[PDB]
Amino acid sequence: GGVPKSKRITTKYMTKYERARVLGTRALQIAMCAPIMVELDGETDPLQIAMKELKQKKIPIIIRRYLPDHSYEDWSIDELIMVD
Amino acid sequence: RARDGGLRFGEMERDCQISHGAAQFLRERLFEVSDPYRVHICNFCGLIAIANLRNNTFECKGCKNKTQISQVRLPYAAKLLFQELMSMNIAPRLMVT
Amino acid sequence: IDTAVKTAETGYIQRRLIKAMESVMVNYDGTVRNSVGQLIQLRYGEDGLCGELVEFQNMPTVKLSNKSFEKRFKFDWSNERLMKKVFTDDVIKEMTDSSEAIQELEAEWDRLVSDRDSLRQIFPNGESKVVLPCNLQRMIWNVQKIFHINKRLPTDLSPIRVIKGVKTLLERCVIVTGNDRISKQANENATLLFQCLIRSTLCTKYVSEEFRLSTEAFEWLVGEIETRFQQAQANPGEMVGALAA
Amino acid sequence: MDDEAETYKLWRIRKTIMQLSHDRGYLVTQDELDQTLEQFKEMFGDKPSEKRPARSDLIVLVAHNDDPTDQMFVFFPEEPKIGIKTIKTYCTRMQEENIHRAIVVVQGGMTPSAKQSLVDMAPKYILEQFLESELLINITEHELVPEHVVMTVEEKQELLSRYKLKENMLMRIQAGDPVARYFGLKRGQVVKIIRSSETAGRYISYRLVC
Amino acid sequence: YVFSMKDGKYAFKTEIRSCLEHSSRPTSTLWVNMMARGSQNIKKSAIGQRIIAILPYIKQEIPIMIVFRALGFVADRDILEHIIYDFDDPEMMEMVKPSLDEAFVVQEQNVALNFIGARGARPGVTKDKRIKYAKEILQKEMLPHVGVSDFCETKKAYFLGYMVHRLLLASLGRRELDDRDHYGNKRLDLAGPLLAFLFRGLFKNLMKEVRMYTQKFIDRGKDFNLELAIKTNIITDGLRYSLATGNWGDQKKAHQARAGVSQVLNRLTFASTLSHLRRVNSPIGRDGKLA
Amino acid sequence: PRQGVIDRTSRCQTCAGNMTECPGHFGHIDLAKPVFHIGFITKTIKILRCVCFYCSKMLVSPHNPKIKEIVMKSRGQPRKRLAYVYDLCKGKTICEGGEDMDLTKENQQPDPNKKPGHGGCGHYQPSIRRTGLDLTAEWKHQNEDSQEKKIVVSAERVWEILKHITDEECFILGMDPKYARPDWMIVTVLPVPPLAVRPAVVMFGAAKNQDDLTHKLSDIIKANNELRKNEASGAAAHVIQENIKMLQFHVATLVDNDMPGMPRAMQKSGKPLKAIKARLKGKEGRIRGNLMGKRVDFSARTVITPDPNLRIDQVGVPRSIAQNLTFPELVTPFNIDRMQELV
Amino acid sequence: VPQSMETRAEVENIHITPRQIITPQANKPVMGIVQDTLTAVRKMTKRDV
Amino acid sequence: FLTGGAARDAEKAKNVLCRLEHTTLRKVTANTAIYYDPDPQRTVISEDQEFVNVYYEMPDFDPTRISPWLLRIELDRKRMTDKKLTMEQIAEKINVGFGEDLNCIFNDDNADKLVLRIRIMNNEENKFQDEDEAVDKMEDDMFLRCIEANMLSDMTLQGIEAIGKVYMHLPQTDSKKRIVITETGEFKAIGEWLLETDGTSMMKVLSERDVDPIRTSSNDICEIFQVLGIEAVRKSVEKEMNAVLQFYGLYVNYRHLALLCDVMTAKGHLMAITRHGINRQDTGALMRCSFEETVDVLMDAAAHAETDPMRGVSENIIMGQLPKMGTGCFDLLLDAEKCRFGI
RNA sequence: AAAAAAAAAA
């Protein structure tokens, strides 16, 4: 049940529950020796690198938001806009 | 303390961890660091199947099934609950398909 | 004795309340549903906002008399000494050049009267204390202090730009999205009190005679109100039933 | 004391019936809604003991605005306990006047056999019933009862298409609810509830009649 | 004790936990109750409030007049002498009327005993044994503290009339109702009576074991030895178990026994030991919502 | 040994695993005569008051418009369907039926396109009473003269009644015959739990005493063997009835021990038996105390003392707790030297 | 102690103390200046200090 | 609440209080007595002799046919004054409660004591009626005593039987006052009289002559359900919760209360938070068994073959899966085409 | 090693 990109009705803003699991999954990926999409300035804790490449929206995660009628909308990271 | 026991992550802790909206902390404190277990389940019948891990054979006695066997990770207390209910003449068939 | 006896039934009541509402969650369409998908609320708290980011606001247009409302909210352009003391000559030149101005301020006054009637219908006992996000008085004070607003010097903010900015802000502050009749009607039903508080406080008299906000201060205020109204919306996936219990 | 109190309660019951008919969308003039007690005493009399007015004299025939051949009878039987004989008399009147809708204002109650007659007679002619004590108060004028609007099938379909809902996932309202009995809601209809909110001003919810 | 019920069929209750002094066959509770006015009956409206008696080992309700006639008082003036001490009092004579009106059929002592015996648990047959059973209720179960011997029906009738007199005094409000938590109506079981009760139980078990041994050795025609007859482990083992464990009763039937009667002595400070040696425990369980 | 292992050094006979690997496998006991399942008893009479005592048909025929309205209303809700069917069948006292019972017209030609009518046997349904596990039936109106007005109903009679119910009447009765046939609520083959459910309690070297479920299953096997020996020898009817009473008592108190009106299962140490219901139901039971509230591994607990020199997102942790508690940090090239000096 | 980095990030981004200042119960802070800190705030901000 | 002249005058509000409060014959009379009166015109009470011959001078019935037994009821004057009652109302109530069986004679208005005399007329047409056996045959004085107890303990003179004590007062806060909008446009609170009654009967209070039908409510939720409807139940529960929390000065946000009020009123009736409202829902078996009555819920789901769709949070907690809630309400997918330059 | 009881801490 792939909803088209023009027909997405969910919010365009990443809430805290998406942010926590995206940061955790990306930190686990960097800790398991994935390539780092951005430059480095001496950060060693991979959760800091996870925020650092979340600022430039360079994280390859597709969030599959589930509507209550068991349909899903796929949103990229760069399609969402950070707020804190 | 004398038996070197862990802390009781009781019901109210589960309540306010639900209130925080943290699914992974709940899954950790209630499945990962308490009692993880792996069981082999027949796909047709949904019950616990025979799994010989040495020669890598699977067999469900109630269905005569040798191939369509899945593997399910679950808490051990849920497995005792299901086996006690199987002693209650109840079939909690875990339809994994 | 009272501390002992009770504590048992209080804990039992807490367990019952948390078990009746353990799976009630705000979903991704903004609606509030239980585990079976049965609809409970179309928006969380009937406005779709989280409880952390709201404050107690004073609604100024409810308890006032009719002559006090006309004195403190009707913008009269005919008082030219006040217009020379309040506005610069560029603003007086701009307002006299346009022909939309008088009927647009009259439309503002009509909307304020209709909002006053709706607020008096909603609150019959005259409660001028609402619970709304985005404290407008503190933000007006913040943009006065940031831009060093002088309240005894003439300003450069035309009232027609105030009306345009308020209308653009209220069009950009949405909760229920869509262009259908149901979606639009649910949008004004969700944002009616917020729109009444915006129009009753960001009026063309208060921002010009009392606050004396400048231009860039006014767009900063509008952008901050829009951003922090976006931030106050309830997150989809937030467990509100267990939080309520 | 019986005549004045009986005239007063008959006037109040008639006013509530006409307000109920106006709320259902039936053609009711303004003077019938604003009919005073003295106007009722002039029009119908003031001595209910000597049949002034009689209980059969207060029969109300009302018609719908959109469809003029869809009409309601309102009967006022004098018997406190209603048997199948008066129900059959009213039903025969409904066939010989070709009207599918009627409300019987009973005084004390009805026999369960008459209730079963209303149940199995229902999907040709709708024959609702009302106690006299329930019709002394207009329920919708209470401050605890918000605005109820009955929806058509088009508005229900638009609602379910917009909110991606199935009919069992909505909130429910019983068919024996006093508001649902007031509006004459059958099973399957959706009622829209508009209420005042202290956080957003007003809120619109939807309920399914079950 | 006189109490009032907010709910139920009883307007007032009179309770005695009567027991014979320092004896077995334990404490029997006798009730003299007033029927409540709230009975929806046409014929009972003319009757009104009515006095009944609840007897030990009888699950039915008996009027007090049949009980008084069962003690040997067929006339009504003698019974009203036994209850109403002053004949000049109007209102108590008004209150004693419905019991007299109800128990009009029974007028003879053996008829009253047959009325009593027909309602007991496991009823007898052909009247008279029931009458004998009724005597076994009226001599060994009704008020053992006033007397269990023969020819004690007069003093028992005096005490029953005093109980009915107190119930009628509390009905008319001339005396205050008794209080449960008034500490004058309480006694403290110390080590003395408690160990006495344990010794009663263990001595009864010892006599039963000795009886079984000598009945085993008497049916074969042989004699017996007294030192081999007495099993000395019974009393010692019972007292040791009920003091070490704290369950105050038989070891097999410790579920019906009170727990925590005997406690380990707290030796942390001298004041803690002195406070543990001077402790009073209420038998109310630690789950009551009543304050 | 075919059900699992016993100590830490053995292997399963079936799956050849240790105590951690083996989930344990079930056994079965073939009972000589069927007995009631106690927790289904309040269900069982709910079917027994809806079907016929003789022909095993429903009291109201399933082509009734009321039954069709109930089925239409209660799609997906079989429990409420059973409640509504039981409310419809509560007032039926006669098994009314017959295709020739509507011959009230005169000179009426028979219809070859007529639907079948109710196939009732014309028998009066008894009122069913119960004082524990004993089930009795009473007829207020007498049937044919060979039937006694008061009878005791064994579990075999209920088994034969519930066996002959067709699948359609099960589906209107709110019980899917694919998984939940009604005749399966009477225990004929008793499942035997594996050794994981009933662990052999070891005290000092060797396992001296088993738990309570093993002793209860020992009583089950002894009572069943006594019953099959007594019916194999052709003994008297009262001996068979006593054996059925003891077997039903042992089965029910294996399942449920807290039902009033029934004698308690007397364990050796002066306590009642802890049955499966006592394992599951309770605050300290398997659901609330072991599934919603299981104990965690990595945790600590100690007394608190103030520290005003700590900011609010900090906690002071003692060195012993910090050495005892660990964190499984992944090894990356970023921190390889520091983790090497740590190990 | 959380035992994974996704749980560690959930503790950081949800459970942490400065994120839990405001109650959703009554839209008020749950933590306030208490005891002698509050007493010396009152004693410091007087005019004569 | 009251409307019109009852709202501002204490006398009409006291009239409303008298029309609402239950006033039986207990609350109003002084004493009762039963006399034997052989001559009604020469009665034993001399003080009655002045007026009883007034009533029998032009009687509506034969004085020979009446029974000699008399019931004399002396009434308290102050209780008649407080309830604003009169003797013709009492005589009319007796005549409509007992029919033609009893003769009722009342005293003068300005006497020293208010005396009522009640007799029974011997219906000689009913004395020859057959079918009378073992019916506790009646004497006339006992019948007079029983009807004396009947009209004493059960006869209602005025008010509603379900309502006990009634209080009349003026509010002192701006919560129970009537708030109106004046001509200037301000808000004015008017201190009108209002009533507080112990015991509720809304159909017999709202339908009164001078009672406000709009602002009058109750604290009984069930009576709001059979009187108004489910949405008024929701608003009434919100109001009672607000009053309960505002008694102690505690403030809870509106959303957390409105969510509970919408959870209970979702199904159309009152869904209580008990085992009778939660376990009767349409949720899963593992969700319902985790709260209360675990074995009963599990075996009902076994007998009905109920499918648990794994949508709740406690169900996934039992399964140990990531629960579809909070931050587990979505799935993260790896973007294949976003994997750009790295290291 | 289990089960039960008792005494306590917040």
Ligand SMILES: [Zn+2]
């Ligand atoms: Zn299988």
Ligand SMILES: [Zn+2]
């Ligand atoms: Zn194995």
Ligand SMILES: [Zn+2]
């Ligand atoms: Zn049959």
